[PDB]
Amino acid sequence: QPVELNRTSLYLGLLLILVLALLFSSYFFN
Amino acid sequence: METITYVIFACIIALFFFAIFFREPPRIT
Amino acid sequence: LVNVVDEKLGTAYGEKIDLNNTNIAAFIQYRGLYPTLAKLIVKSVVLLTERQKQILRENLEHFTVTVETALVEGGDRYNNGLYK
Amino acid sequence: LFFQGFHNWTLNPFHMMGVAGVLGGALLCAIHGATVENTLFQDGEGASTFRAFNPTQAEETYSMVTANRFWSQIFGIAFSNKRWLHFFMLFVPVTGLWMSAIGVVGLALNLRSYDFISQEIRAAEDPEFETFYTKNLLLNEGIRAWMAPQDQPHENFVFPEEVLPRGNAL
Amino acid sequence: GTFNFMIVFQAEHNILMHPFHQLGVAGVFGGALFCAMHGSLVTSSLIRETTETESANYGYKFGQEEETYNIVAAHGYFGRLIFQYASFNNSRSLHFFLAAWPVVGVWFAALGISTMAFNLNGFNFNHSVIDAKGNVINTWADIINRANLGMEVMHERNAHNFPLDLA
Amino acid sequence: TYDDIVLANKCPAYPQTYRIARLCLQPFLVKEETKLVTRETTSLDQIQGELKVNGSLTFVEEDGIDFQPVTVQMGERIPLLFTVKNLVASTSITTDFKGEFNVPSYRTANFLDPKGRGLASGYDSAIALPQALARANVKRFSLTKGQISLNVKVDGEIAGTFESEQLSDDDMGAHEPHEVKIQGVFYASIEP
Amino acid sequence: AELTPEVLTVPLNGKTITLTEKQYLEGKRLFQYACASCHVGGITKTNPSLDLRTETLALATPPRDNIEGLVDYMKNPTTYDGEQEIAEVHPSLRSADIFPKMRNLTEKDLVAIAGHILVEPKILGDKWGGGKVYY
Amino acid sequence: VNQLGLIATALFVLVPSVFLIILYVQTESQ
Amino acid sequence: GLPWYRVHTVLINDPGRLIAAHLMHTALVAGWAGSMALYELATFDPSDPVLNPMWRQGMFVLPFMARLGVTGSWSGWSITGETGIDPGFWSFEGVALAHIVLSGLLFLAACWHWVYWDLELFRDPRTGEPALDLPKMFGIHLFLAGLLCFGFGAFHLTGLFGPGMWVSDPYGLTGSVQPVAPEWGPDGFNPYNPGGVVAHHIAAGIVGIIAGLFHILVRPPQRLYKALRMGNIETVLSSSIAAVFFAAFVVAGTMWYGSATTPIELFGPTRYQWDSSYFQQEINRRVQASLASGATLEEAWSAIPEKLAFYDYIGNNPAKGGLFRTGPMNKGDGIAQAWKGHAVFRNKEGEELFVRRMPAFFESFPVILTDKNGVVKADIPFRRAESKYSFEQQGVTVSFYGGELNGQTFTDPPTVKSYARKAIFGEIFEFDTETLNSDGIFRTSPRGWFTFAHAVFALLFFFGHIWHGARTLFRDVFSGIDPELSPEQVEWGFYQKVGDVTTR
Numbered sequence A: 001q002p003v004e005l006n007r008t009s010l011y012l013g014l015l016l017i018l019v020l021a022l023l024f025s026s027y028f029f030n
Numbered sequence B: 001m002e003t004i005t006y007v008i009f010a011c012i013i014a015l016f017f018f019a020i021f022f023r024e025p026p027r028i029t
Numbered sequence C: 001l002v003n004v005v006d007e008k009l010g011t012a013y014g015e016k017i018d019l020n021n022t023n024i025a026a027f028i029q030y031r032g033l034y035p036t037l038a039k040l041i042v043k044s045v046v047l048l049t050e051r052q053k054q055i056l057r058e059n060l061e062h063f064t065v066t067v068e069t070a071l072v073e074g075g076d077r078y079n080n081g082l083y084k
Numbered sequence D: 001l002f003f004q005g006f007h008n009w010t011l012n013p014f015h016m017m018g019v020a021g022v023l024g025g026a027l028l029c030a031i032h033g034a035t036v037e038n039t040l041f042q043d044g045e046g047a048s049t050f051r052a053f054n055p056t057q058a059e060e061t062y063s064m065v066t067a068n069r070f071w072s073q074i075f076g077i078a079f080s081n082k083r084w085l086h087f088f089m090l091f092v093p094v095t096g097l098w099m100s101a102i103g104v105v106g107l108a109l110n111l112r113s114y115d116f117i118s119q120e121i122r123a124a125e126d127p128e129f130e131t132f133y134t135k136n137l138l139l140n141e142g143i144r145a146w147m148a149p150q151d152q153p154h155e156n157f158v159f160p161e162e163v164l165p166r167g168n169a170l
Numbered sequence E: 001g002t003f004n005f006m007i008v009f010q011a012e013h014n015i016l017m018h019p020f021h022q023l024g025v026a027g028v029f030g031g032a033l034f035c036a037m038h039g040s041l042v043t044s045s046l047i048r049e050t051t052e053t054e055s056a057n058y059g060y061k062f063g064q065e066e067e068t069y070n071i072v073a074a075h076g077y078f079g080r081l082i083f084q085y086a087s088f089n090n091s092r093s094l095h096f097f098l099a100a101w102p103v104v105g106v107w108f109a110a111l112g113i114s115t116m117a118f119n120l121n122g123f124n125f126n127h128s129v130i131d132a133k134g135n136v137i138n139t140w141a142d143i144i145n146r147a148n149l150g151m152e153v154m155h156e157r158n159a160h161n162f163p164l165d166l167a
Numbered sequence F: 001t002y003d004d005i006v007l008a009n010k011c012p013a014y015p016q017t018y019r020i021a022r023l024c025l026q027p028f029l030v031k032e033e034t035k036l037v038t039r040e041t042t043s044l045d046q047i048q049g050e051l052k053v054n055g056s057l058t059f060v061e062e063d064g065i066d067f068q069p070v071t072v073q074m075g076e077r078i079p080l081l082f083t084v085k086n087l088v089a090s091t092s093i094t095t096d097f098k099g100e101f102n103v104p105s106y107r108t109a110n111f112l113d114p115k116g117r118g119l120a121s122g123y124d125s126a127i128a129l130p131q132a133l134a135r136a137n138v139k140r141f142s143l144t145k146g147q148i149s150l151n152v153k154v155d156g157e158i159a160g161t162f163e164s165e166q167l168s169d170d171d172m173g174a175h176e177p178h179e180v181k182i183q184g185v186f187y188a189s190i191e192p
Numbered sequence G: 001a002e003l004t005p006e007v008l009t010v011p012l013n014g015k016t017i018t019l020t021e022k023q024y025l026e027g028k029r030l031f032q033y034a035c036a037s038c039h040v041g042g043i044t045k046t047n048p049s050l051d052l053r054t055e056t057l058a059l060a061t062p063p064r065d066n067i068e069g070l071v072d073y074m075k076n077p078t079t080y081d082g083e084q085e086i087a088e089v090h091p092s093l094r095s096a097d098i099f100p101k102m103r104n105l106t107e108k109d110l111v112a113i114a115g116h117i118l119v120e121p122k123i124l125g126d127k128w129g130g131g132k133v134y135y
Numbered sequence H: 001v002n003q004l005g006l007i008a009t010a011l012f013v014l015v016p017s018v019f020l021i022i023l024y025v026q027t028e029s030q
Numbered sequence I: 001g002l003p004w005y006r007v008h009t010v011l012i013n014d015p016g017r018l019i020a021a022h023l024m025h026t027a028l029v030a031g032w033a034g035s036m037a038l039y040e041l042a043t044f045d046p047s048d049p050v051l052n053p054m055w056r057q058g059m060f061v062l063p064f065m066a067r068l069g070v071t072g073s074w075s076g077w078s079i080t081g082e083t084g085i086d087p088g089f090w091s092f093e094g095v096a097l098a099h100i101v102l103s104g105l106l107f108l109a110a111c112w113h114w115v116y117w118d119l120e121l122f123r124d125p126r127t128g129e130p131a132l133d134l135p136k137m138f139g140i141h142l143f144l145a146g147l148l149c150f151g152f153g154a155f156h157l158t159g160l161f162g163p164g165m166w167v168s169d170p171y172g173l174t175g176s177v178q179p180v181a182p183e184w185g186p187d188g189f190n191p192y193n194p195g196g197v198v199a200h201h202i203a204a205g206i207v208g209i210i211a212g213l214f215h216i217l218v219r220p221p222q223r224l225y226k227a228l229r230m231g232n233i234e235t236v237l238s239s240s241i242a243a244v245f246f247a248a249f250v251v252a253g254t255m256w257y258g259s260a261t262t263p264i265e266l267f268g269p270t271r272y273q274w275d276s277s278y279f280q281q282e283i284n285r286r287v288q289a290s291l292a293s294g295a296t297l298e299e300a301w302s303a304i305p306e307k308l309a310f311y312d313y314i315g316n317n318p319a320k321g322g323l324f325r326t327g328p329m330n331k332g333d334g335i336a337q338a339w340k341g342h343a344v345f346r347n348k349e350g351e352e353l354f355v356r357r358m359p360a361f362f363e364s365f366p367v368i369l370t371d372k373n374g375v376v377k378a379d380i381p382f383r384r385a386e387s388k389y390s391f392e393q394q395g396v397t398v399s400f401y402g403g404e405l406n407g408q409t410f411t412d413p414p415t416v417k418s419y420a421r422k423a424i425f426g427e428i429f430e431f432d433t434e435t436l437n438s439d440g441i442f443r444t445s446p447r448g449w450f451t452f453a454h455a456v457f458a459l460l461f462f463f464g465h466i467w468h469g470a471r472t473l474f475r476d477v478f479s480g481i482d483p484e485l486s487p488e489q490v491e492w493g494f495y496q497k498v499g500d501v502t503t504r
């Protein structure tokens, strides 16, 4: 079965990750 | 290494630029 | 390198009224001293009015003379940011 | 106020995902509520629009096309899927309150994001490096010593009038 | 810096005991509730248009004239959930409530900050419950008052030269 | 008057006991081992002393606003307590005033650092790092001497230009003080 | 506990006078009328050295831990050593001209402020004259 | 800081970012 | 196509490729346990289990190997204190290598079951569809679980054919691996009694064997099969996720509260052993048992073990680190080199002052020296100008008994105050802040980290239980509700019973 990931889901899922890592980088560097 | 990692924010602006102007458009259906 | 205010506590400043270092508010613990004589003292163990000399001499065993530069500079002899 | 002083729970990243989820939920409540209510179709001849809806109807009561064109030019992005919009309304406060759970489970074990170790290394050998972070930590020392002899009576904290962290004149 | 602003504000204005902030928390907790409520009652009520082998999001095509979810089923669901008359069976009356509850909530909360600008502080129940002798029986608002004292004697440790924090 | 000023930072041969009644000093050469990032809270004013004739007029200052916290940007910011606190300067006044004064510490003993550590109040520890510094832990109050050479215009009210050499804030011992040289003008209004 | 004559006995001049539950409750109110704007909780807001503690007041010149000494203070307020006279900066019955909240204080109503100032540290503890440390 | 503080974030940005871009190029290509 | 979060749902109607995806998960888990233990061997300093044991080094899976008998290495070191031992094959290396060898073998098995999905064993003979008999599968696996529960309890744990388990004295000084006999009375439900842990597995193994035999030979009711949708395997998922979060809640508790399964020589002291001053009471119980023999204080304190006083130190409390304060506990305070001794604080009166020990809530804590009669006699003041109870004013000296500083007395108040800020942490130890750059910022033990993961997993698996139980009971409706859902179906009082069309 093929995986569909439309461009909005690339855009939100990149938004989900980048603002997660903008959050947690302050704590991963600590 | 610290600040230049944080300046992740430049990827967000590029996503802010891409998801506004280069989104797959809403289609009247 | 030691904190000179804390090193001032272990000597006779931190047992009595050091007449060169304590706040003018630390004179309220005895009679007659505050605020006229306390103004006259802050401004060897002190001697003026004759009743003031009798207040001071009755208090002279409570008085210490040991000048610490942190404790007196910047007008901390009169107000040290220590209130209620 | 306990969790600020003792846990620094504001600084915890799992609470911020909860604040982003709750305030995102309250935003998506307010935005979607006012977007629908201001893209309504005129279905009744009265100036109060709530009687232009019977529930057995199968029309959209509001213009999702206009609503998408409003927000695409105001904000830049807009929902165009009404099912994805309402899943995002389910998603955002529920993921936020689930992230705050993970932080509080950590705070059960006192696993705080209390301190950025790199900054208190910087501030303990430099007495001029002040950030708002070290100011909050000074506030937490205020909370943890002024509140605790009353907040925690079992411990028999007898804190004298001189161990209390106090700024100048207060 | 925001968290500095929140801590100092509670130390000086007792924002938690201010009812306008409490209506604001009622606006954002309700706002997040009614978001997840409305988000989950619409998602609960979506008509089958797709297969379980693809996403239910494709049951909506943008600009369609049919409503993508059954409003009668969601009202039938949520009406049986609490009782029938607690339930907006009117979609327009529903989305006014979704509009108005966080907005009037955050209006009052912004009016909290704007009125504690002029030092109209939160409710001050310090030493309110006292006994027959007159001994202060501490309350939960007296435990907040010791936490409020903790932040306020420590905020801007060097800025105060005088005992009262007027502004 | 005060309404058409709010100039308050600016100061405006003459031949028995005499007194200096209103000594202003309006200035910051900082020695590399500037700018004024402090805006205009920099002048000394309303200083009252005692001009004691000996040939040399000894000027034991006593009272007045005679200290100003000044931060200058080298970009390193250099706090200095610009002062003439307890100055004894000395020279018919036409005339220099080769005087030596004491600067205190910038921050006094009540001052708390970002980690709560201060001299008369605060933590003698570094309570952030519980099981770990001593230079920043113990605050070391400085009182180093500075030297000023006023150079006397003459009416009762006289004026000219000063130049003081003092050290900077040493941050209670936590770093090294720069040598600040404070050039500027002055005005002293002598009255018996 | 209970407000009781063991709490309402306070030194009058070496004699003790007994307050009533009406008089102590009246003089809390007359303390909050004309005194507690500065003397809230037993401190002095405009001079945090001179608290209204009994030990402070017993150590004032003349002794002001008495009810006769506190009513003599409210008719002739001195400094803490009694040398300088402060009825032009402190509320008194010599200063009805300039402290209008003192004009309606009679000799059975000042004794309740003298009563409230002495009874209250036994009621609160360290809290009277203790400040925000003791809230 | 932590010397594993960027690798904790680079493998937090890029590890799902490689994943969502792989997913997008395999569904763009149909 | 499929959404990205639905990509694994190609294995529901594929039981052979469900087994392969499972074999690969089990290969990755067994591969991690080998990889984690080999990395743990590469960083374990084993030459001092007294002051630097496995829980000080952030050894995660080294105590789980240790608690079931694995004690030595091929290198030569045993964790119990010896060196030169030959523990045979089952070392920490051999266990880890067995887990990597398992992981390669489960990999190739997953490769086989992925290609050869189309076995007739999954195909139902009466309808040609790939079907799993989940009731009979359950009783088969429940029989195997109880066989391996009984045999682990009655052979491994009893020691009859097996090593036993880690047993301890209550203060964790001479704890080792011993065979444990089963506790069959009510004291076996004491979680700190290890005889119940043996007797659980014997008894629950038999009951699981008995029930495994039951679910093989007894079919589900027609109404229990249909309530749960026992034909669907999402119901096995939703009730197994329900089990593993219950079970992760239990292991979060029994790690945090402590049990016999979670000893303190392996996972560290619990936070409740610092709350009660549980080691401080024991330390003073030994000292007063020599203060009544006539043995003087320097003698009566040089007999306290260094391991015992190390448990009475707040940097071993698991409620004392932080969520991003990462790494071993030795990254915090350091490597404990020796006990500095018991700091006895006396004023210039020579009367003994007792430091208020810090609770695990506090980052900062004021140093406050009460007496036996409770009244505060000395403190390190914040505001020092109006002070009354400073160490300089009250003449406080510190004397050390046992440890490094046995018979040393410091009277100069800066050195007394430094030792006083370390005496709020309990017993004072000399730390190596040079081996691994120990910045003093307290860390968490393997007891605290395990509780965090397994109570956040158990909460995250609460949602997964809810989600997959939602998917099971509502399987017809996760594409959406019926388009032909009648308005008279959810209308009130059109049916006498909600849901039923025969009650109109």
Ligand code: CLA
Pocket (backbone or CB within 6 Å): I025, I026, I027, I029, I030, I032, I033, I034, I037, I061, I062, I063, I064, I065, I067, I068, I070, I095, I096, I099, I102, I142, I145, I146, I149, I204, I205, I207, I208, I209, I247
């Ligand atoms: C083939 C046999 C085998 C053996 C002898 C071992 C041995 C070991 N493993 Mg390994 N492991 C194995 C297979 C094996 N493993 C496989 C196949 C995997 C992949 C799934 C793993 C993944 C793994 C990990 C991730 C870890 C280990 C660890 C360990 C060590 C400690 C085990 C422990 O204390 O946990 C406790 C074990 C249990 C509590 C078993 C759970 C059983 C539960 C309680 C049953 C409850 C539900 C039950 C079905 C209900 C019905 C019961 C019924 C009777 C009524 C021990 C050396 C640890 C280690 O130290 O690594 C080096 C470790 O971290 N193993």
Ligand code: CLA
Pocket (backbone or CB within 6 Å): I004, I005, I006, I007, I008, I009, I237, I241, I460, I461, I462, I463, I464, I465, I467, I468, I471
């Ligand atoms: C043993 C437990 C178990 C098993 C066998 C499954 C299996 C499944 N889940 Mg479920 N679920 C579980 C526990 C489990 N889940 C838990 C604990 C949660 C709460 C977090 C959920 C919440 C959940 C939701 C909300 C959904 C599923 C869905 C699914 C299905 C598709 C999975 C997929 O393709 O994701 C694809 C996964 C990826 C592409 C990777 C990203 C996933 C996250 C972001 C990172 C994964 C963590 C990391 C890689 C390793 C985890 C280690 C582990 C210890 C946790 C599959 C049947 C989906 C479904 O039901 O569709 C019909 C679905 O929508 N699950």
Ligand code: HEC
Pocket (backbone or CB within 6 Å): G031, G034, G035, G036, G037, G038, G039, G044, G046, G047, G050, G051, G052, G056, G057, G060, G064, G070, G073, G074, G078, G079, G080, G086, G089, G090, G091, G113
């Ligand atoms: C603010 C303007 C005040 C009001 C209103 C009242 N008091 Fe006061 N009080 C005030 C000051 C500044 C001082 C200190 C004066 C000094 O000597 O420098 C005082 C002092 C007293 C005292 C003496 C306390 C002591 O330490 O001996 C008493 C007994 C006293 N005040 C009583 C008092 C009463 C009874 C009042 C109400 C009628 C009252 N004061 C009002 C400032 C102010």
Ligand code: OEX
Pocket (backbone or CB within 6 Å): E008, E012, E155, E156, E159, E165, E166, E167
């Ligand atoms: O600046 Mn920011 O905070 Ca308003 O109060 Mn006053 O000033 Mn400061 O003290 Mn509190």
Ligand SMILES: [Fe+2]
Pocket (backbone or CB within 6 Å): D032, D036, D086, E038, E042, E095
């Ligand atoms: Fe809606």
